[PDB]
């Protein structure tokens, strides 16, 4: 029962076998989930599942920098459905973020900004409704 946008701290940063578990419900008739993995006012890793985009569901990746987007990473695997629980898993790694929703492996996103240590916000937004969040090292 958090509150969204429901901001998790990441005090010093992300470092390779940490593991952020965000767990929810997709709302009915949603539009759109974000994860933003934020380095001070820009988004290292940007996680963008759209329900409806063109009468398709896709997963966009991106990261922003001084206010603007850099080149967009596509996956049309889709593993979240409107009204239903979801458990996401984001394991951090030496070379990329690895995403994986229900226990499934979904995608990689390789690190743009390298600086881990100043990854130490993570924004969770979106049609849904928040249960819990949590990081670990493992
Ligand atoms: O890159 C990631 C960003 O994406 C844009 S949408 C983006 O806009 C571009 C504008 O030039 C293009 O239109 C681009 N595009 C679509 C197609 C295309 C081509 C063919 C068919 C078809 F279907 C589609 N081609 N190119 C769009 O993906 C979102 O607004 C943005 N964002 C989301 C949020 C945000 C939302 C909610 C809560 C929150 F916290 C943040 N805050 N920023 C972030 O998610
Ligand atoms: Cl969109």
């Given at each position: 029962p958090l509150t969204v946008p429901y901001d998790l701290p990441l005090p010093g940063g992300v470092m390779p076998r940490m593991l952020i578990t965000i767990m929810g419900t997709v709302k009915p008739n949603a539009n759109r989930i974000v994860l933003d993995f934020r380095r001070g006012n820009d988004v290292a890793f940007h996680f963008n599942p759209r329900f409806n985009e063109n009468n398709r569901r896709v997963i966009v990746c991106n990261t922003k920098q001084d206010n603007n987007w850099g080149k967009e990473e596509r996956q049309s695997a889709f593993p979240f459905e409107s009204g239903k629980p979801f458990k996401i898993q984001v394991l951090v790694e030496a070379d990329h973020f690895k995403v994986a929703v229900n226990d499934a492996h979904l995608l990689q996103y390789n690190h743009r900004?390298?600086?881990?240590?100043?990854?130490?916000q993570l924004g969770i937004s979106g049609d849904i409704t928040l249960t819990s969040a949590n990081h670990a090292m493992i």
């Open positions: 900004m390298k600086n881990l240590r100043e990854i130490s």
